[PDB]
Amino acid sequence: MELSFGARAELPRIHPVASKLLRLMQKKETNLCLSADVSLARELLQLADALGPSICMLKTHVDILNDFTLDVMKELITLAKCHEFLIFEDRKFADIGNTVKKQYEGGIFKIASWADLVNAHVVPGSGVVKGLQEVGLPLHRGCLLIAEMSSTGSLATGDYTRAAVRMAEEHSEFVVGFISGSRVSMKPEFLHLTPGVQLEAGGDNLGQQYNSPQEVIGKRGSDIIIVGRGIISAADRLEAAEMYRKAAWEAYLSRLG
Amino acid sequence: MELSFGARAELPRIHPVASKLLRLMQKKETNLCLSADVSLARELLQLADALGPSICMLKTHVDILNDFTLDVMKELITLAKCHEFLIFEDRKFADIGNTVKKQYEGGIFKIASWADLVNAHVVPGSGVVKGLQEVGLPLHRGCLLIAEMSSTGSLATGDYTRAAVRMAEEHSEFVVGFISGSRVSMKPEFLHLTPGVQLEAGGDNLGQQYNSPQEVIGKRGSDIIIVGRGIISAADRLEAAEMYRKAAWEAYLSRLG
Ligand SMILES: Cc1cn([C@@H]2O[C@H](COP(=O)(O)O)[C@@H](O)[C@H]2O)c(=O)[nH]c1=O
Ligand SMILES: Cc1cn([C@@H]2O[C@H](COP(=O)(O)O)[C@@H](O)[C@H]2O)c(=O)[nH]c1=O
């Protein structure tokens, strides 16, 4: 029983953040997350504004913005609200709960104040999620757990991936899904977001491996494609994003019937 | 069979950063790394100045500083040079090489400009090291790989730990050791730093587990203890740091003979 994004948004155990995401994916016909790996706030905001209508999510690495300020993130929130997409900071929290709680709430980035979604590696055990969730629950935030990775030599396989799935299931009041290369949970309440995506076959020179939208959404059963250089390196980033959106969207439609 | 810190600093394959660290550990009779998990730059610099004589290393989480600026790291360097300790930013790089390279050099933190040491998780595969190396080698830096973690439910065990050791030994131009709970490499050129250390048994309420300096250095074979709250929460932080220094140092001496 493969359900549309809109119906999954109505599932009994759905987290509010995931429901909001799934509703806008259905409304806008996009399951594309732009990975805005840029070093200038001006470029980040110009990309968010021009590509907002094409994306369900904008993934940030605020630690590579040379001119980060909280005012930049306020402007980004305004665009996310205007164009209707979630903001996902790819922070990869990956330490004991006492530390990650401080990294999520505090410091100069104050990630919890502007990020709808964050992610975490599961290697430290569930305390990483327990620490994050203390901050995220009053703020109605959600978290994605990295169950699989797209890079060569990834150790996020086998029992490690199963441990991520179990951890997500155990913390479903905060964890809304996974970073993975394929469907890893059979529960339709969880989102699957897949990086390592490009239209053409290949990789990079530092261990990144790419698969196509049709492969990851259609055959591997993921929900959302995360695309950075496949868009950001094009001259016309809008046309590139539209190519990726149509690819991922039609791949999703094909598995409904 | 076991070599003093001073003799390890002279080994043919020793990395310069490890050598520099080992030499100052011997000179100052300290194998204590202070974990300065604080929210204010003022507190970071006051602790570095007051406790610098007692430590071989100061471990930072710059992303928890509410008022981070590069001028704070310039002042920290001056203290590190004066008191002779290394600066270890506990960044936990943990993604594909192309991303971590930018995170290490760029953004607001400019970590490579001031951190003698950083660490990385090995879950992405060796690309995480290859990316960091492109920034750290020109800047004469070292990196620690997280082979084991101190937290309940850690997945950094078994084959994962072995994969970390192999990764380190194959990138010895840049990787100088590990975050681990024990000796994980038999090569004396590599340093073992162990967090989760307190004098008394216990843990915290978010999955941290503690072992004593004598257990970690003496029976488990590690080189350096990383201590945060055990010192920072003490009324007399200098006396606490001295207690941890003497404990770890004597356990190291005992192991030698
Ligand atoms: C957890 C995870 C994250 N990213 C992130 O996804 C984006 C992929 O970008 P690109 O499409 O340019 O390779 C980058 O921001 C990267 O750090 C991956 O590529 N793979 C992963 O397994
Ligand atoms: C990789 C790793 C890091 N830290 C860090 O070591 C310090 C431990 O501090 P405390 O002594 O306050 O528990 C913290 O900064 C924490 O994030 C651990 O505790 N355990 C780990 O496995």
CB pairs under 8 A between A and B: 177
* Cβ–Cβ below 8 Å for A125 and B204: no
C-alpha to C-alpha distances, A88 to A116, A156, B169, nearest whole angstrom: 6, 21, 35
Nearest alpha-carbon partner for A117 in A80, A150, A149, A147: A80
Tokens of B119: 């660490």
SS3 A222: coil
φ, ψ at A13 (rounded to 5°): -95, 15
H or E stretch covering A97 = helix A97-105
Site to probe by mutation for ligand 1, drawn from A226, A227, A233, A243 as the one with most ligand atoms within 8 Å of Cβ, is A226
Nearest alpha-carbon partner for A225 in A198, A202, A207: A198
Strands A32-35 and A57-60: parallel
Tokens of A175: 């964890």
Nearest alpha-carbon partner for A47 in A39, A55, A36: A36
φ, ψ at A129 (rounded to 5°): -70, -40
**Tokens 């850690």 belong to which residue?**
B154
Looking at the CA of A151, which ligand is closest? 1
SS3 B3: coil
CATH number for the domain spanning B203: value is 3.20.20.70
Alpha carbon distance B199, A62 (integer Å): 38
Which residues make Cβ contacts (< 8 Å) with residue A62, sequence separation at least 6? A68, A73, A89, A109, A111, B107
Tokens of A5: 């994004």
Question: Which atom of ligand 1 is found nearest the CA of A150?
Answer: 22
Q: According to DSSP H, which parts of chain B are helical?
A: 5-8, 16-28, 41-51, 70-83, 97-105, 127-136, 159-170, 213, 229-232, 237-256
**Tokens 């941290």 belong to which residue?**
B208
- Helical axes B41-51 vs B237-256, angle rounded to 10°: 50
Set B27, B74, B81, B92: catalytic member: B92
Alpha carbon distance B85, A100 (integer Å): 26
- CA-based end-to-end distance of chain A: 10
| DSSP symbols for B111-124 | GGGT-SEEEEESTT
* Cβ–Cβ below 8 Å for A207 and B124: yes
Tokens of B149: 């973690």
Q: Is B153 left (phi over 0), alpha (psi -120 to 50) or beta?
A: left
The total of structural domains in chain B comes to: 1
**Tokens 């003022």 belong to which residue?**
B42
* CA A91 to ligand 1 centroid distance, Å: 11
Alpha carbon distance A68, A70 (integer Å): 7
Nearest alpha-carbon partner for A91 in A147, A52, A132: A132
Which residues make Cβ contacts (< 8 Å) with residue B249, sequence separation at least 6? B29, B30, B31, B32
| Helix, strand, coil in percent for chain B, rounding step 5 | 45, 20, 40
| Helix, strand, coil in percent for chain A, rounding step 5 | 45, 20, 40
At residue B245, what is the residue type? Answer: R
DSSP state of A221: -
* Structural domain that includes position A109: 5-254
Chain A hits for B230, CB-CB cut-off 8 Å, are none
φ, ψ at B87 (rounded to 5°): -110, 125
* Facing A154 at nearest CB: one of B107, B123, B150: B123
* CA A18 to ligand 1 centroid distance, Å: 21
Tokens of A78: 């305004």
* Cβ–Cβ below 8 Å for B151 and A125: yes
SS3 A200: coil
Exposure pattern of A116-136 as b/e (b: 16+ CB <10 Å)?
bbbbbbbbbbbbbbbbbbbbb
DSSP state of B108: T
Q: Are B64 and A105 in contact (CB under 8 A)?
A: no
| DSSP symbols for A120-171 | EESTT-THHHHHHHHHHTTTT-EEEEE----BTT----HHHHHHHHHHHHHT
* CA B218 to ligand 1 centroid distance, Å: 41
Is B101 known to be catalytic?
Answer: no
Task: Using CA coordinates, name the residue in chain B closest to A162.
Answer: B155
Pocket of ligand 2 (CB under 6 A): A 95-96, 99; B 35, 37, 61, 90, 146, 149-151, 179, 195-196, 208, 226-230
Tokens of A51: 């590509």
Alpha carbon distance B148, A75 (integer Å): 40
Set B20, B49, B95, B246: catalytic member: B95
Nearest alpha-carbon partner for B122 in B89, B152, B151, B156: B156
Q: Is A224 left (phi over 0), alpha (psi -120 to 50) or beta?
A: beta
Please report the beta strands in chain A, taking only residues with DSSP state E, as ranges in sequence order: 32-35, 57-60, 86-93, 117-121, 142-146, 175-179, 191-194, 202-203, 209-210, 224-227
A74-77: which pairs have CB atoms within 8 A and are 24 or more residues apart?
A74/A114, A75/A45, A76/A44, A76/A45, A76/A48, A76/A114, A77/A114
Radius of gyration of chain B (CA): 17
Q: Are A24 and A84 in contact (CB under 8 A)?
A: yes
H or E stretch covering B126 = none
Is B90 known to be catalytic?
Answer: yes
Is A110 known to be catalytic?
Answer: no
C-alpha to C-alpha distances, B106 to A212, B16, B138, nearest whole angstrom: 30, 24, 14
